[PDB]
Every structure is written in C-alpha cells, then in structure tokens.
C-alpha cells in the first residue's frame, strides 16, 4: 500500500508551552455552547491547580420562575443584612462551577 494522497507535514509550536489548558464539561452537551451567555467572574490558583467560575443567569425570561427564586434568596441569604449576600438582588443573579 503506497502512500496515496495528503502526505502532510507536522510542526511543533512552543509559544504556549506553559500557557495552554484544556477545559471539559461532562454535564453539558457539545451543541450547548457556553459562548452566548455573558461571563462575569473567575478565579485560579497556580499550584494544585484549580479554578472557580461565576456565570450570569437571566432572571426576567419566563423560564426563571421568579417566586421560587425569591424563596431561595430568602432561604440562602439574610432577609435584610445583604452585606456579603451571595446575590446583590433578592433573586438568583448568578451560578457557579
């Protein structure tokens, strides 16, 4: 079996040797791209490398049930303290990974 077609070459780039990461989401389909929804905040640590991500979520659209959101807010954050509330409003403003 002689080589037929597309006898292509290969090359090595060192430009990003320490700068490259691959990130994978087991719990979400490949077609459900994350690009559209505005990203808000993220955190990293160099050694024992781990990251945290903070993700905006729409509250006005119908599929957000506002009443249950308010109940969750009252259940998770102080009624009127709000000094370090997980959410600025009285509803779920965001969700984290």
């Amino acid at each position: 079996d002689d080589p037929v077609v597309q006898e292509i070459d290969v090359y090595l780039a060192k430009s990003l040797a320490e700068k490259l990461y691959l990130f994978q989401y087991p719990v979400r389909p490949a077609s459900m791209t994350y690009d559209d929804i505005p990203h808000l905040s993220a955190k990293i640590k160099p050694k024992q490398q781990k990251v945290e991500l903070e993700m905006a979520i729409d509250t006005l659209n119908p599929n957000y049930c506002r009443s249950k959101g308010e109940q969750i807010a009252l259940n998770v954050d102080g009624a009127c303290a709000d000094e370090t509330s997980t959410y600025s409003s009285k509803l779920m403003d965001k969700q984290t990974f």
């Binding site: 037929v4 006898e7 290969v10 090359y11 989401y25 490949a30 599929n63």
Partner: protein, 186 residues
C-alpha cells in the same frame, strides 16, 4: 359498581379510534403564547442521550481517520482543533538536557517541522517520526463540551482568559511493535 355487563367483539372502525383520539388530545391551545408562557427554543430541557437531544421538534455514524481528515481537507478547508495523545516516550533522546534514563517528551523539544503524516492505499495511516513509524487511530468519541483555552498570567495578582475553540475529535498514537520486531529480530 356495575356487574351486569354484555361485552362486544364485532369489528370496529380504525378511523373512529383516530377521530376519538383527535377529539381527546388534538384540541390544541398552543395559541396561548403569552409572555410568561413563552419558551426560547434554544433553552429546552434535553434528552438523556446527547446524540438524540431532539425530544420535541418545531412541528453516531461510523467513521475512520482517513475519512475524517479527507473531509476536513476536501469538503471543508477551514481551521480546526484536535486533541491527540502520544506514546509515553518518543524515539528521540533528551536533546542536551543532561539526563535515570528519563523519557523524552514534547516539552523538551524545539519548534519547527517534526515529521510527516502518511496516508496509504486502503486508508491505512502512519506517522513518520524520524526513523520510525507510529500507528495512529481515532480515540473514543465525545459528545460533551471540550473547550481549548489559553491561560495568560499577566501579573502575579491578576491575568486574562481567552477561549480559543472547542475539540471535536481525539487521536491515539501507538508504536508498531510488530514492525520493530521485524526490523530487529530477537
């Protein structure tokens, strides 16, 4: 509760069953597209199996590496990202790294051309790397998100994130032990 029951077994009419079901469940009220009942079609709940995420409509196939690359050349000719995993150690020796017999790794090589990919009749594939050929096959298929990104640590306090793209396929590369034995008999 009734006890006196005379059953019937004479042949019935199929279109009558269809009409009854139509009357029972086809009296649509979907015209109630009120604000709080609107559904964004790109926000649906999803089928368990990723490939068949089409539970309600608006109303994988076999593959091989030679096929993948040649469609990636002929039918499409734009850029794409691939994730491939190589043998533990490459044919090269550590270049002036001063060595324990450590395995050479891509992290210890220089830039530039490193070899060629050879496609042979009947679709066999080989990676010509120096004096040796390593066999190549596609990896386990994936259906979930795999985003390629670059981590720019601009400062010890803070840095920057940019997404570069997503990965659609995986490749596995392996030494051809049969070939090595054939070349050097034992």
């Amino acid at each position: 509760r009734p006890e006196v029951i005379q059953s019937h077994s004479i042949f019935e009419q199929g279109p009558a069953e269809m009409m009854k079901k139509k009357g029972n469940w086809d009296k649509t009220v979907d015209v109630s597209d009120m604000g709080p009942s609107h559904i964004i079609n790109i926000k649906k709940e999803k089928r368990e199996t990723d490939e068949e995420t089409k539970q309600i409509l608006r109303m994988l196939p076999k593959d091989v590496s030679v096929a993948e690359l040649l469609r990636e050349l002929s039918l499409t000719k734009e850029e794409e990202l691939l994730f491939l995993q190589l043998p533990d150690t490459l044919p090269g020796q550590p270049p002036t790294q001063d060595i324990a017999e450590n395995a050479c790794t891509l992290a210890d090589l220089t830039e530039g051309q490193v070899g060629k990919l050879l496609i042979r009749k009947s679709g066999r594939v080989q990676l010509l790397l120096g004096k040796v050929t390593l066999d190549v096959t596609m990896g386990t298929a994936c259906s979930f998100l795999q985003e390629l990104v670059s981590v720019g640590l601009g400062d010890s306090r803070t840095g920057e994130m940019t997404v570069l793209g997503h990965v659609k396929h995986k490749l596995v590369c392996s030494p051809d032990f049969e070939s090595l034995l054939d070349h050097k008999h034992r």
